């Protein structure tokens, strides 16, 4: 997260870290046994880390649970990042409390102008590299589809939306991928891609979760 603020320990209780010996992507807990992330975060041998603030210090509220199954969206295209969404089933159910909690799926899509909360342990610099150890937060609005398509000609599908600031300076970044975009208490987006980070006229692009609720629900019901 570039240009954000320190969230505070366990104030984003649905935020997960995906760990393969190191943090490499975020994710969102959507019930006690399932995490949603970005398909471009796929790899084998994922441990899901819940209840994290400092990802380098054991602080006492963590739950570490290995993945038993990963399901990349059937139509994920790694060249265009269309359908950049994946489900991860935990080997055992998480213990839910005030610091580890699920986030609700949306029943409707959010409109441009809605303010959302984006969070992650990704890079905090637009030119250098500096990775934080504690969770960072950013409040950002959903942008109109017209401004999104004007910023990224020929690249925005109906399964994507832009959020952020056309002026630059505030954005998600590398290492935030897979993490949540939460608006009015519902998971509306997944950190997916962008050109650089926090560049002028290059806002962040997010997977539009409301298009996938039927697939998520049917997949969880049968796996
Ligand atoms: Ca920790």
UniProtKB/Swiss-Prot annotation:
Known tissue expression: Synthesized in the acinar cells of the pancreas.
Disulfide bonds: 7-137, 25-41, 109-210, 116-183, 148-162, 173-197
Keywords assigned: Calcium, Digestion, Disulfide bond, Hydrolase, Metal-binding, Protease, Secreted, Serine protease, Signal, Zymogen
Keyword Aminoacyl-tRNA synthetase: no
Catalyzed reactions per annotation: Preferential cleavage: Arg-|-Xaa, Lys-|-Xaa
Lineage top rank: taxon: Eukaryota
Ligand binding (Ca(2+)): 52, 54, 57, 62
GO terms (BP aspect): digestion; proteolysis
Xref: Gene3D superfamilies: Trypsin-like serine proteases
Every Peptidase S1 domain range: 1-221
Necessary cofactors: Ca(2+)
Post-translational modification: Subsequent cleavage after Lys-125 leads to alpha-trypsin. Further cleavage after Lys-170 yields pseudotrypsin. A cleavage may also occur after Arg-99.
Cofactor note: Binds 1 Ca(2+) ion per subunit.
Subcellular location: Secreted, Extracellular space
GO molecular function, one term: serpin family protein binding
GO cellular component, one term: extracellular space
Pfam families associated with the record: Trypsin (PF00089)
List of catalytic residues: 40, 84, 177
Activity: how regulated: Is inhibited by scorpion cyclotide trypsin inhibitor TopI1.
Family according to the record: Belongs to the peptidase S1 family.
Subunit structure: Interacts with SERPINA1.
Name by which UniProt lists this protein: Serine protease 1
Lineage of the species this protein comes from: Eukaryota, Metazoa, Chordata, Craniata, Vertebrata
Gene name linked to the record: PRSS1
